[PDB]
Amino acid sequence: ALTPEQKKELSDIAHRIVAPGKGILAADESTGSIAKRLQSIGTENTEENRRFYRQLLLTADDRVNPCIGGVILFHETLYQKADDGRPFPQVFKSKGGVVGIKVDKGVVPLAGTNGETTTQGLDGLSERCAQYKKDGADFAKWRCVLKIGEHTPSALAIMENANVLARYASICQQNGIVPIVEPEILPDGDHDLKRCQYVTEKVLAAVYKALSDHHIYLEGTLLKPNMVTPGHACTQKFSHEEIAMATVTALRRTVPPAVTGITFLSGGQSEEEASINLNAINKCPLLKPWALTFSYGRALQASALKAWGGKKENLKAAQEEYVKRALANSLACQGKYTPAAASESLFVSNHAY
Amino acid sequence: ALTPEQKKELSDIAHRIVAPGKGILAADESTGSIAKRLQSIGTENTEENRRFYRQLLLTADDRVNPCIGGVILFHETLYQKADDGRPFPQVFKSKGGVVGIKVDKGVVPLAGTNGETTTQGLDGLSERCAQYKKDGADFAKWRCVLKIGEHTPSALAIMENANVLARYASICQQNGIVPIVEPEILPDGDHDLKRCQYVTEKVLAAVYKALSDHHIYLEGTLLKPNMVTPGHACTQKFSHEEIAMATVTALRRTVPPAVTGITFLSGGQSEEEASINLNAINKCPLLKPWALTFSYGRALQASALKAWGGKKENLKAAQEEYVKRALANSLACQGKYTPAAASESLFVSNHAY
Amino acid sequence: ALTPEQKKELSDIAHRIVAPGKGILAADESTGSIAKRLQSIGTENTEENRRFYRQLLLTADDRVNPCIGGVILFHETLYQKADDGRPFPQVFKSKGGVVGIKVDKGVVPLAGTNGETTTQGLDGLSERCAQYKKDGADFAKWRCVLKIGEHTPSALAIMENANVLARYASICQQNGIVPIVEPEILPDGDHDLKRCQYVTEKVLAAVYKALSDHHIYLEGTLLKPNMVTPGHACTQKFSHEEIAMATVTALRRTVPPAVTGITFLSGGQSEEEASINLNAINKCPLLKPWALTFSYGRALQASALKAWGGKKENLKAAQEEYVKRALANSLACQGKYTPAAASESLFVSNHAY
Amino acid sequence: ALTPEQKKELSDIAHRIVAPGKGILAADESTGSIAKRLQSIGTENTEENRRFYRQLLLTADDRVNPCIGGVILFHETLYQKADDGRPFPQVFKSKGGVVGIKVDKGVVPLAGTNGETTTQGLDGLSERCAQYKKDGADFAKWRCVLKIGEHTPSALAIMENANVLARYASICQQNGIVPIVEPEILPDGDHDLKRCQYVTEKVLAAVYKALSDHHIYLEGTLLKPNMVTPGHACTQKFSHEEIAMATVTALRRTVPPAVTGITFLSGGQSEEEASINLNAINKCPLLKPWALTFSYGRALQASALKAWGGKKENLKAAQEEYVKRALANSLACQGKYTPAAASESLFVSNHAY
């Protein structure tokens, strides 16, 4: 499947990204779905605004060096230049970070099912990843989404999603790109915490069997899951020790140790819940043989975005907000996080990007 | 999963294609694969050469019109005009024929395996089928490929080409297009007839499970299976009765009677051996609750292509060769067939198009 | 797996049992669960009563010869002698019938599931079947049960039941015993007809993949399914043309043609509904490439039992009731059935035996 | 699926067994398999000979009591009394030890396969575990067996021994008994180390999927895996560091950290090679989030059995041999081990007991 030279390259890359203290910034929103984040702060969705906004994030003045191993970028963002003319991958790489690339092509429905979806992307994938590798990306991301309704997530969806996740992983590692396997269970719903924990266990079990089946090399992988969390509409209330227990036991029962790190997705939690729960998790007493960090998008950019507010004059003001959150999360990601747009929940029904 | 009006349209469309005596012409070859076909008769691979050849086949005389209920076309040639300026789909729909479109986008390796392959094309398939339906196509073809070797076809290779065919079928049918699922086991190899049987059985069983699993509507499908023949390099010889029993046994054990019909591919058999074997099969005493007919590419055009020689002067001779193999096959799929470049083996190693 | 001599023996046996006009009498109730049928007619459950009652059935005076190919007997009933000293297998075999044997050992729950069950039996099976073969049994039965609730029948249960069914089938054919594969979907419930039809399609798809997976020889098998039928508690009303359509399309979409016959279980329908629906089915216009007959227990013995009423003096009176029903069902099993304890529904919540 | 008190009892019981330094003695041999062990030292296979041998092992001095937290017993010997009239389970429970019971009932062929096997014993397992729990047993062992050959272990063989182990685990745990799931890949064969690795990986991956699928509680399980060693007849030699990395890699890629501990079997290694390899494994720099210890049959008793010679006079010499291998292993499972019939290969072809 893979030579040893090729396994060292992936294992290396994978550990780099989640070395101690570091997480991933998810700046990988599609054009259409970044556009509605910009509309949130009354900014027109334009190549330059998008470029400007991404540039603000990749140029954050260096206390974020120890906190941000990697950045997932959307396809166009990887071919965009800082204002000095320098391509964004080289701007971020020079500072010791690693560039990632969102390669899925969005979700697609599953006939005969109660709203579930595959996602698509695999076509032309390997040649795309060849390009993205030569243009500076050392890891990729692929988002699949399941939801919890009563007859959701069905076997059919879990089986097909874990499988496409495995196809993609296998194509990425062929091209020396560490795959990020994201089986996101959406928080959409009334479900309680344990319901979510069970669905997450069944999903990840299915994904890691799929990965085994497709002979993907787990030491050169990372996993971006949802934390385990009550449904949005869940009335019952659950602590962060309970969410971190639920989340950590879910992961100990499914994710074999060889997986090099677990970079959590925000899930639509507020920026601060995200860092508290991330921290709680790392402080969970149980034994956690993988890197438990963050790959947050919205939970590292809410404060930033509403600082920037479409206006060039706050660039520094927005990127100091960004930095604050990265530092918060680089401590949560060690257990060392002790602490109001950052508490605004960032929930989005059927989050798409 | 599908409304009743939709199941009616599919069921109807599928029964038209494979009504008694009708078979299908597979004119579905890639510009890359009809390349090598044209070089075998000195002709250059130029659009109007492709357009002309395809034009010759589709415009054969109406002695063929009870023999050919459908034509699988390649993308390009769905959108070419004949010499009257008529779009190709109409010249054929005018005659009471049905226009099929190949939707797969080639094959692609499966990492971890001794040579095996999966097939790609699902990205965008939803919209493509939609357009193709508005533009004439009423059925689609997706080709999957297993080879037989000592560790081939893997379990992973079977489970992946099965759950891609199903994904594809699911999408065609939601867009009102009758999928032809083609799980082709290639004759490449030394293998016994009984071996090709066991593989053929195990494959169809995993296909029909997959179609079950994705809630496909078997009444508006067709199976395009290989015959079960010994390897191309097999030393033992087996009778046309044995090929014909092995094929009809293998399918009696795996293919729900609900499937509307099955369109055999030629596989590399000579034109004439295809007709004979199709005939033995339909003359088999066993009970075969589906339509057993042909969807032949090379075993309808070889005689016509060599007669065509690239020379516009040869048109009606080229076509009355095509027309004879169409009449031969339209009796072989009824049992009534009875009888030199139509004797030639048309075997390409690892066929691809 | 199996030689050809061994495949002829099974195929032979299987066709014998479901030759035209013939069905199977299911006299295979366990001791404890026959005891509550006897309690129904105020008879003590004793070796002799049980023997007497079984003997009454196997000795029915010869117009049942053309109607009853086979009889499934419970284990003790196979070692019991008619009053003339003759062992029951030899009494029934002399008349041209074939003896069958119930080899499962009842159901067992599935941890973590909403009431579902495996069944058990496989242990020591092959040596048991060796004995049952030498003692006259040429076919066996194995009952698995699924139910329809909202979260019933789960994947886990369908997967494990279809698998044990396949294990058992494979052990039976090793010992020249034709297996009867019964995936019974219980009528317990409020479900409508199509719900049942879908669950039956998903179940049988799963069973026939399982059989393929375990390399069982379908031509030497029979299948005892539920018909497709509204739930007991279903309020909506459905015709017999609708139940026969539902049942026949369900079977055309799952049961490959090689399966030699389909012997239906009564399901708790009244004795007469059972024969009407069986008949309707055979008159379904759609193409039915397997034998569609009956393997009824309760729908051939309700009238008999309440005739016999624990009293030796009605023996002839009870066995003329038995005969009537066998004849009714040997015509329904041809399509030729034209027609009040026989309309008493025989439904039993979680039927067990 | 299981209450919290029950999960506590299982989790506790499992942690006792495999607490730091403790390992398990597998005294679990069939009367048929301890037959051939006794004939290897001239002793006749008589109950009191079995009783005495077992008595010798269980009553070794309390220098062993930090080395042996459990004993897997065969059915017979759970119910034998020592010389003080004490039941065996108590003589061992008295010392702070835990009594294990083997519940499998031998293996049985899988038809359709080149030699492969499944294992039986699930019939009655529910009640048996119940009794066994009341009578002393707090954990069970079920042995499954894959061999490595060219078409071995089949997919069917893996999926069947996986879903039997899970059925078994499910039943033990509902009856409050900690299952030891033993997927043993036998060293029979010519195969490379890397080969045994790939098979070992693919097997555990299908096991842990199965346990997921049946809702097993991994905190109250133990894995009894083979080491990953080259075939018994392999020509290449591999270092104790390589065996030890291959074993610990294979498990890091498949075994959820939730599993309480893993008890290696001896496999045929010499007593001494078992201790060395257990030690290399625990001295591996990789991170191993589970307890890595021993559940050794032949690699604890060989020295003791040859010393025993059948001669009651040899008792304390027999046992201080046993006790030395118990002390050796109780350091090898801590890394602290450092160092002639304990050098002998104990390989039985196709081991069975």
UniProtKB/Swiss-Prot annotation, chains A, B, C, D:
Disease: Glycogen storage disease 12: A metabolic disorder associated with increased hepatic glycogen and hemolytic anemia. It may lead to myopathy with exercise intolerance and rhabdomyolysis.
Main EC class the enzyme belongs to: lyase
Pfam family of the protein (one): Glycolytic
Keywords: Acetylation, Cytoplasm, Disease variant, Glycogen storage disease, Glycolysis, Hereditary hemolytic anemia, Hydroxylation, Isopeptide bond, Lyase, Phosphoprotein, Schiff base, Ubl conjugation
Residues with the N6-acetyllysine modification: 36, 102, 105, 324
Other facts noted in the record for this chain: In vertebrates, three forms of this ubiquitous glycolytic enzyme are found, aldolase A in muscle, aldolase B in liver and aldolase C in brain.
Family under the similarity heading: Belongs to the class I fructose-bisphosphate aldolase family.
Modified residue annotations for Phosphoserine: 30, 33, 40, 126, 266
GO cellular component, as recorded: actin cytoskeleton; cytosol; extracellular exosome; extracellular region; extracellular space; ficolin-1-rich granule lumen; I band; M band
E.C. number: 4.1.2.13
GO biological process, one term: muscle cell cellular homeostasis
Highest taxon in the source lineage: Eukaryota
Modification type N6-(2-hydroxyisobutyryl)lysine: residues: 93, 141
Cross-link (Glycyl lysine isopeptide (Lys-Gly) (interchain with G-Cter in SUMO2)): 36
Subcellular location: Cytoplasm, Myofibril, Sarcomere, I band; Cytoplasm, Myofibril, Sarcomere, M line
Summary of subunit composition and partner proteins: Homotetramer. Interacts with SNX9 and WAS. Interacts with FBP2; the interaction blocks FBP2 inhibition by physiological concentrations of AMP and reduces inhibition by Ca(2+).
Known pathway: Carbohydrate degradation; glycolysis; D-glyceraldehyde 3-phosphate and glycerone phosphate from D-glucose: step 4/4
Keyword Ubl conjugation: yes
Residues the UniProt record annotates as site (Necessary for preference for fructose 1,6-bisphosphate over fructose 1-phosphate): 353
Positions bound to beta-D-fructose 1,6-bisphosphate: 37, 266-268, 295, 298
Protein name per UniProt: Fructose-bisphosphate aldolase A
Cross-link Glycyl lysine isopeptide (Lys-Gly) (interchain with G-Cter in SUMO1), sequence positions: 36
